């Protein structure tokens, strides 16, 4: 097929979503199928970047503005649980992972990063 340009780095968005996924499952959270929020699909890479762009997680959560950051993430406003589900969804995901020490980062990252780099040979 025309697709299949594997071999080197898959990209930052892929590396981020991969690292979080590996940790989530290894932490007791099975996310092999697909993550969902507010009845819709969400990209950990896109979500992670969004929070960081909001002056860090502290701002997003403390200043109570998940509505805006999430809005850009493409979430249904009709969901009366997307707001609360999101708060707990990130607090139990992004928070936990983001709390990981340099070891869990290098270990989990080095594993995935190499898995893709040396995927060829």
Curated annotation (Swiss-Prot):
It comes from the Eukaryota. It is found in: Nucleus. Residues 10-102 form the ARID domain. Disruption phenotype: Embryos die before 15.5 dpc and show severe cardiac morphological defects and altered heart-specific gene expression. Some, but not all, of the homozygotes develop an abnormal groove in a region just anterior to the midbrain-hindbrain boundary on the neural plate at 8-8.5 dpc and show a defect in neural tube closure in the midbrain region. The ARID domain is required to target the PRC2 complex to its target genes. Regulator of histone methyltransferase complexes that plays an essential role in embryonic development, including heart and liver development, neural tube fusion process and hematopoiesis. Acts as an accessory subunit for the core PRC2 (Polycomb repressive complex 2) complex, which mediates histone H3K27 (H3K27me3) trimethylation on chromatin. Binds DNA and mediates the recruitment of the PRC2 complex to target genes in embryonic stem cells, thereby playing a key role in stem cell differentiation and normal embryonic development. 'Jumonji' means 'cruciform' in Japanese. Associates with the PRC2 complex, which consists of the core components EED, EZH1 or EZH2, SUZ12, and RBBP4, and various combinations of accessory subunits including AEBP2, JARID2, PHF19, MTF2 and EPOP. Found in a monomeric PRC2.2 (class 2) complex consisting of at least SUZ12, RBBP4, AEBP2 and JARID2. Facilitates nucleosome binding of the PRC2 complex. Interacts with SUZ12 (via C2H2-type zinc finger domain); the interaction is direct; competes with EPOP for SUZ12 binding. Interacts with histone methyltransferases EHMT1/GLP1 and EHMT2/G9a. Interacts with GATA4 (via the N-terminal region). This is Protein Jumonji. It comes from Mus musculus (Mouse). The gene is Jarid2.
């Amino acid at each position: 097929g025309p697709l299949g340009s594997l071999g080197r780095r898959w990209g930052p968005n892929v590396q981020r979503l991969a690292c979080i996924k590996k940790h989530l499952r290894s932490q007791g959270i099975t996310m092999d199928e697909l993550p969902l929020i507010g009845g819709c699909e969400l990209d950990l890479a896109c979500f992670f970047r969004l929070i960081n762009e909001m002056g860090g997680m502290q701002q997003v959560t403390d200043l109570k503005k998940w509505n805006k950051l999430a809005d850009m993430l493409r979430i249904p406003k009709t969901a009366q649980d997307r707001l609360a589900k999101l708060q707990e969804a990130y607090c139990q995901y992004l928070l936990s992972y983001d709390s990981l020490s340099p070891e869990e980062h290098r270990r989990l990252e080095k594993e995935v990063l190499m898995e893709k780099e040396i995927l060829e040979k």
